[PDB]
Structure 1
Amino acid sequence: PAVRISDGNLIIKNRTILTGVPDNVITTSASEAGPVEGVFVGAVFNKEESKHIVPIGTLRNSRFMSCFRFKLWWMAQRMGEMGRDIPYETQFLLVESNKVYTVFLPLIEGSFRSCLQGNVNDEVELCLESGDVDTKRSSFTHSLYIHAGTDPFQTITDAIRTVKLHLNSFRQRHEKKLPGIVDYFGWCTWDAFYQEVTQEGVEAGLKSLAAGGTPPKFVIIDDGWQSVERDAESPIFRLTGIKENEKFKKKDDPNVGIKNIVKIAKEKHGLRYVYVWHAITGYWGGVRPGEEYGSVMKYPNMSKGVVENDPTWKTDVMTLQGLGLVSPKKVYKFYNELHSYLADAGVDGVKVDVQCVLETLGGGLGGRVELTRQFHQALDSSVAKNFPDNGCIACMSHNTDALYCSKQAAVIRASDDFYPRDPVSHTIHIASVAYNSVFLGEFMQPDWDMFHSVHPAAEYHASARAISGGPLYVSDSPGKHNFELLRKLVLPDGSILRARLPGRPTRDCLFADPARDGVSLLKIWNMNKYTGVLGVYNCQGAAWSSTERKNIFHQTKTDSLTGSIRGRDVHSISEASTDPTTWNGDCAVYSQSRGELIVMPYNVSLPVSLKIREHEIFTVSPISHLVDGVSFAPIGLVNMYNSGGAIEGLRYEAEKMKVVMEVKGCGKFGSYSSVKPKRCVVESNEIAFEYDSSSGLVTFELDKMPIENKRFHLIQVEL
């Protein structure tokens, strides 16, 4: 049976993972298409309760990685060996048997949501909550799912799909429509102006970016454009109407609102998309109590796991001053009127924020899962009507309540905010995004957030954004730009080189905490179509503290650390080979910063050494062997972080000793060749190239962007 409770012990492929499983902890593997290859888990209790907790079993000497909510809104990573180290509010837990990998997915079930928490006795406990006193239950069959396999990433995905086949209440990332913004550079006003943003600031930020040759094709007008008011210390603000405030009304004709800056953005400055920010509850303090939308004051319910990890939530302005919560009966009316107004003004999407609050406001109304479902149901209906390119970015949304009802939305902020003025944040941001994407990336495309192009950590953030697989945008104040940096990310038409997957830790890094263990470098892998990409980060020296309950610096024993890369760290690198059945695993590896090309045989390590807050990017291309002595691998646009993303087509013709490629973009193009090319041809005309006989690096300039909708350079390399 493979995954079974036998005696009081949890056994997986004949390894004990857990011991001492209570007698009340019930399994089942039946489903519509019966044979389930892992197991659903639940529990019978005595009484009708709105909160429950049962140990699943006792976990010892088994490496894990967990993603846990350090705050209501956001997750971060924790590794350990013992059940006691599992944090409160653990929403995703992956266990290594030493070869074999087990995932534990705490689920929503009816009106209940579960998570994992460790206790002092090393038991893994299942915490079950409705977030509502009037919604109570004694027995559950499907509040956890457990599945195991020998590829950690494939194990995760296979489990998620099985959970999806049970619930039918979400879709996986790859089944959703990505809105078009993800293929372009954007800018977001948040760090530029905070809430003091005006339409004149919008226009200035778009002009300053385009002026330097890296034009954003989307903008996020963030928090600060809505009509909000304090109740009639620090007071909370509530939405007073759905239309823009006076900073977004054309100064000349007060009856023309946000339409003005949209039309300026698009017509005058060439933007393809405009998005705006709003809280899932309208604003931070919700909507002002009123008839129109049924808004009535609600006060956040505290839950233990949340409060345990974030004690400041007890005294937070939202918690103490409440929110005007729009009624479930009128929630669709609210989103629709807001979004209809926005869409009729030419807005293409919304960054929907403060999302987890709903788990704390289910008191009257069905509890946490139900309130979440209802709001998202309405939100998704309005989005599909009003923003039909699927214009929704989910923010502050890292709860299982939301994730398991993520049926439509396709982009999710993967971490806590970029914080330009907080030195502790930068290493942590890189770690959180990477680890969180392991799980969040099964649901939606991770968004690794805005960043500053002018900042000590700019390269560190930007390089990470390049290999993220997600939208790429800055929050630069106007005129504070590093265009040399930006050209590494953004082509002259505003298109980017997006990788195809959520960027994730290598197999290598899944169980070794690169923020805390003091020994390991973080390696992040992604794919393009015909290359892999690998980013290496030192992100030691900071993390959330289990004692201080916040992000701090902590002690590190060296500044510099040495790890290594292998072609195969790029987990799916074989999908980039034009001939995987004959491919012997050899890769061309190009160091983006050092500008160095190395041939790396299958399994040969190359050492990499980095001080804290340093990084390196490598493009990893499968070598094709045309004949004995004629070997080749494309690299792409070598002065861009994700160089391989420029290669759209690749074909080998060994009978003619020829390589045929389709390449997007412009700038310097690089390839590995064992021999000096006879000819390099671009659009039928021979072009000059250089060749470094000792590295095999071939180079030539793709001078301009492809000529008119003819999307690609056609390149022939004759060897």
Structure 2
Amino acid sequence: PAVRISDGNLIIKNRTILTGVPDNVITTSASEAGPVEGVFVGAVFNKEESKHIVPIGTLRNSRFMSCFRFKLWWMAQRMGEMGRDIPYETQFLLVESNKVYTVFLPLIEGSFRSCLQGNVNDEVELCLESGDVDTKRSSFTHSLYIHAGTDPFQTITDAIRTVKLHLNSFRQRHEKKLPGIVDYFGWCTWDAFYQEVTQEGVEAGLKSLAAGGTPPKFVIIDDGWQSVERDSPIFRLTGIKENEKFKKKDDPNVGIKNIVKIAKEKHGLRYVYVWHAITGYWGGVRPGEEYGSVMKYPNMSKGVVENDPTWKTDVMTLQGLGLVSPKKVYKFYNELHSYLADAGVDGVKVAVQCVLETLGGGLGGRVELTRQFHQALDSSVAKNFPDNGCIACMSHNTDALYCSKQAAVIRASDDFYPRDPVSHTIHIASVAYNSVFLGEFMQPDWDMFHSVHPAAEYHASARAISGGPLYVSDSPGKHNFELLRKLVLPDGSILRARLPGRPTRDCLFADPARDGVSLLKIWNMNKYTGVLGVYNCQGAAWSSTERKNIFHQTKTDSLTGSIRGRDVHSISEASTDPTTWNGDCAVYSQSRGELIVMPYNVSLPVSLKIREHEIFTVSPISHLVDGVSFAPIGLVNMYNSGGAIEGLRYEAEKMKVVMEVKGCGKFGSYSSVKPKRCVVESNEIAFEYDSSSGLVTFELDKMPIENKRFHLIQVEL
């Protein structure tokens, strides 16, 4: 049977994960299609209610990782061993068995949303809420799904697919179209000007980054462009057009079209995005007949308030939101977005998403109001921004995730806070662990950062390995181009990795923000290399007592951990012959400038102090003949070097390697022997060769000529 409840125990492949499983908990593996390698779990109750806690069982001595909502809008990670350690508002839970990994996915069923939570007795409890007193229920069959496997990343994906086949309300990440912005460098106005952003400031920032040789090809005009008014009072949307700062200096009938033309035609941007809340603005839309806006006041749910008590006295909660009617929500988004699309705007960054869950009172609840708003947002986006131009922001609730049918980019953490020194380590931990779960739905966006900042290289390097959009919110003139050149090429393009950056197998269950012992290792893939980033992000975490992000004591400053080729979980998929491949890798340290050969399973020591990091490119070695091995590295002066290699063919019969490389700069490869000739576009070129390490090195001079996209490279051993 494989996943079953016998006696009062939940049993996974002959290991007891939970005990004391109460009588009223019903399971089922039946489906549409029809048996399933796991178990939908529900419960039946006496009373009809809008809220229910139900013990699923008792969890002891079984290491887990959780993503839990520390604010209404965002998730972060927590590890532990006992049920009591499971935070309120836990939305994804991963359990290990000392070999076997088990995922618990609390789900949406009908009008109800579920999350998990611990209590003092180590019970894992399932909290089912509708977010509206008028919407009540007593039986549930499908509120939690449990699935087990031996690869923890595959286990997660397989459970998500099964949940998709049941709900049909969302698509997996790999099934959605990414917007073009992910392939380019961008700039976001938010940290530069905040709400004081003007059209002259937008131009200033685009101009200054292009001047330094790293021209952005997209821009996010962030919060500050819209027309808003007060009734410290909350602002509400008064119209869908732009405010006075984005009307031309001259002719007020030309609006945001102006900064769009200037960005595109004058400054050579490809895309322009703008920001709006899902509700219009922070305080919604000013009440009116037009969009049916009526004042609503956020309802507090206990889990949220327990972890984020300041949400109780937040401005949106006390002063309320003008909530567009469901009957009119499509009209609202379509008229807003039609205006923008007609002005040359290519997408929207849509924020404040989770409020919807608090406004379902009298309206069907949190799941239904969320489905309705998202259905209409998705229609409006597909219509008006057909490049799928939507970035999800403040959207870490499951209500939204399990109805994510179209949108393909999601902010994966709380904001970048240039001025809060506690935030930087936490940001990196959060973004990695959250991406384990959010990445199954959308491509994670690791947020803007600043190029001139003490933690600049820490953020930048992590963004390079994220697989996400790469953008800064530098103020005009406050740039570090030596840093930016490691991320962005002269035409604005980046070296994006294929997957969401994620923690390695050996970090999934060791909390690198809290355990004072481990470095965080993050992996990702390119076509022909993996990449691995190592971070000491110790010293700071969300506190369960203070309920906010704080510094905490750690015994050392410096920590030692180890790196292995197989830390890059999917590294086989970079090898040109994964059946013959013996598992050995060329490991290039970006910072130290060192190439080392690492045999399958051999560990390499890495030492890092807090806020330090190191990036390694990891290339499977190909064995052409005895004594002639090779592995491509890529653009060695960029963080994700391996991201440059577009094609790779080994012709062992002619002792030759053929590569298609994009970009320009110093190219690097591993070779156990001195090449005979290195050729770039049918022309021999000079190279250097470190005989001791095998590092081959030459210059790719210009960006590819044309339109012709890749440099063709032949390395002749």
Query: Equivalent residue for 1:149?
Result: 149
Deviation string, structure 1 residues 316-373 (Cα, Å, up to 9, x no partner):
0000000000000000000000000000000000000000000000001100000000
Deviation per CA, 1:568-614: give whole Å up to 9, x if none.
00000000000000000000000000000000000000000000000
Query: Deviation string for 1:144-183 (max 9, x for gaps)?
Result: 0000000000000000000000000000000000000000
What are the Cα deviations for residues 601-634 of structure 1, in whole angstroms up to 9, with x where unaligned? 0000000000000000000000000000000000
Which of 685, 688, 700 is the matching residue for 1:687?
685
- In 1: Cα distance, 2:5 partner to 2:398 partner: 25
What is the rounded CA distance, in whole Å, between the counterparts of 2:483 and 2:238 in structure 1?
Answer: 41
Q: Distance in 1 between matches of 2:90 and 2:303?
A: 9
Match of 1:90 in 2: 90
Aligned pair count reads 717
SS in structure 2 at match of 1:313? helix
State the Cα deviation string for residues 222-278 of structure 1 (Å, max 9, x = none). 0000000001xx110000000000000001000000000000000000000000000
Task: Name the SS for the 1:128 alignment partner.
Answer: strand
Distance in 2 separating the partners of 1:457 and 1:493? 26
Offset at residue 188 of structure 1 (A): 0.1
Q: Secondary structure at the match of 2:37?
A: coil
Mapping for residues 52-71 of structure 1, pairs under 5 Å: 52-71=52-71
- How far is the alpha carbon of 1:483 from its aligned partner? 0.1
Distance 2:620 2:438 in 1: 29
Q: Secondary structure at the match of 2:121?
A: coil
1:457 CA displacement = 0.1
- 1:678-713: CA deviations, max 9, x gaps? 000000000000000000000000000000110000
Deviation at 1:78, TM superposition (A): 0.1
CA distance in 2, matches of 1:143, 1:469: 31
CA distance in structure 2 between the aligned counterparts of 1:411 and 1:7, rounded to whole angstroms: 44
Determine if the alignment matches structure 1 residue 134 to structure 2 residue 140. Answer: no
Q: Which residue in the other structure is 1:661 paired with?
A: 659
CA distance in 2, matches of 1:5, 1:304: 30
| Secondary structure class of the residue paired with 2:43 | strand
Aligned to 2:100: 100
C-alpha deviations, 1:378-426, integer Å up to 9, x for none? Answer: 0000000000000000000000000000000000000000000000000
**Which digits, 9 at most, give the CA deviation of each residue in 1:12-64, with x for residues without a partner?**
00000000000000000001111100100000000110000100000000000
**Which secondary structure does the structure 1 equivalent of 2:169 belong to?**
coil
Structure 1 equivalent of residue 265 of structure 2: 267
How far apart are the structure 1 equivalents of 2:679 and 2:437? Answer: 44
Other structure's SS at 1:261 match: helix
Describe the SS at the equivalent of 2:233. coil
1:329 to 322, 327, 333: 327
Aligned-residue identity in percent: 100
Question: How big is each residue's C-alpha offset from its partner over 1:526-577, in whole Å with a ceiling of 9 and x where there is no partner?
Answer: 0000000000000000000000000000000000000010000000000000
CA distance in 2, matches of 1:11, 1:65: 19
Residues 176-196 of structure 1 show CA distances to partners (whole Å, capped at 9, x for unaligned) of 000000000000000000000
Secondary structure at the counterpart of residue 34 of structure 2? coil
Mapping 1:402-413, distance limit 5 Å:
402-413=400-411
Secondary structure of 2:653's partner? coil
Rounded to whole Å, the distance in 1 between the matches of 2:301 and 2:59 is: 25
- Once residues 45 and 5 of structure 1 are traced to their aligned partners in structure 2, the CA distance between those partners, rounded to angstroms, is 19
| Corresponding residue for residue 30 of structure 1 | 30
In structure 2, the partner of 1:298 is 296
Residue 494 (structure 1) shift: 0.2
Structure 2 residue aligned with 1:498: 496
**Deviation for aligned residue 1:87:** 0.1
SS in structure 1 of the partner of residue 153 of structure 2: helix
Q: Distance in 1 between matches of 2:278 and 2:477?
A: 32
The runs of 5 or more residues in structure 2 that have no matched partner are none
The reply on whether 1:214 has 2:201 as its aligned counterpart is no
Other structure's SS at 1:35 match: strand
Match of 1:444 in 2: 442
Residues 68-110 of structure 1, C-alpha deviations (whole Å, 9 max, x = no match):
0000000000000000000000000000001000000000000
Q: Distance in 2 between matches of 1:188 and 1:577?
A: 37
CA distance in 2, matches of 1:8, 1:457: 51
Could you say what secondary structure the match of 1:36 adopts?
strand
Q: Distance in 1 between matches of 2:653 and 2:262?
A: 55
How far the C-alpha of 1:450 sits from its partner, in A, is 0.1
> What is residue 473 of structure 2 aligned with on the other side?
475
The answer to whether the aligner puts 1:565 opposite 2:568 as a matched pair is: no
Q: CA deviation at 1:521?
A: 0.1
Kindly state the Cα deviation for residue 2 of structure 1 after the two structures are TM-superposed.
Answer: 0.5
Query: Displacement of 1:7 after TM fit?
Result: 1.1
Tell me the SS of whatever aligns to 1:328.
coil
CA shift digits 1:209-231 (9 cap, x unpaired): 00000000000000000000001
Query: Partners of 1:113 and 1:77 in 2: how far apart?
Result: 20
Instruction: State the alpha-carbon separation in 1 of the partners of residues 255 and 52 from structure 2.
Output: 50
Gaps of 5+ in 1: none
1:610 aligns with 2:608: yes
Equivalents in 2 of 1:62, 1:5: separation in Å?
17
Cα deviation 1:497-530 (Å, max 9, x = unaligned):
0000000000000000000000000000000000
C-alpha separation in 1, matches of 2:453 and 2:346? 30
Separation in structure 2 between the aligned mates of residue 701 and residue 99 of structure 1, nearest angstrom:
46
- Equivalent residue for 2:535, pick from 537, 545, 557: 537
Tell me the distance in 1 between the aligned counterparts of 2:321 and 2:115: 26
How high is the TM-score relative to the length of structure 2? 1.00
Tell me the alpha carbon deviations over residues 423-465 of structure 1, each in whole angstroms, 9 at most, x when there is no partner: 0000000000000000000000000000000000000000000
Alignment RMSD (CA, Å): 0.3
Provide the secondary structure at the position in 2 that maps to 1:38. Answer: strand
What does the per-residue CA deviation read over 1:665-687, in whole Å, with 9 as the maximum and x for residues that have no partner?
A: 00000000000000000000000
* 1:48 correspondence with 2:48: yes
Q: Distance in 2 between matches of 1:289 and 1:567?
A: 59
What SS is found at the alignment partner of 2:675?
A: coil
Alignment correspondent of 2:362? 364
Partner of 1:675, secondary structure, is coil
Deviation at 1:482, TM superposition (A): 0.1
Tell me how far apart the structure 1 counterparts of residues 145 and 215 of structure 2 sit (CA, whole Å): 46
For 1:702-717, what aligned pairs fall within 5 Å after superposition? 702-717=700-715
User: Does the residue aligned with 1:270 lie in a helix, a strand or coil?
Assistant: coil
CA distance in 2, matches of 1:273, 1:429: 27
SS at match of 1:706: coil
Q: After the TM superposition, which segments of 4 or more aligned residues of structure 1 sit over 6 Å from their partners?
A: none
User: Which whole-Å CA distance do the structure 2 matches of 1:278 and 1:437 have between them?
Assistant: 24
CA-to-aligned-CA distance 1:632-682 (integer Å, 9 cap, x gap): 000000000000000000000000000000000000000000000000000
For 2:589 and 2:700, locate their aligned partners in 1 and report how far apart those are by CA, in whole Å. 20
Q: What CA distance in whole angstroms lies between the structure 2 residues aligned with 1:161 and 1:321?
A: 41
- The 2-side partners of 1:76 and 1:130 are apart by 23
How far apart, CA to CA, are the structure 1 residues paired with 2:415 and 2:12? 38
The whole-number CA distance in structure 2 between the counterparts of 1:262 and 1:542 is 41
- C-alpha distance in 1, partners of 2:199/2:220? 12
Q: Which residue of 2 aligns with 1:519?
A: 517
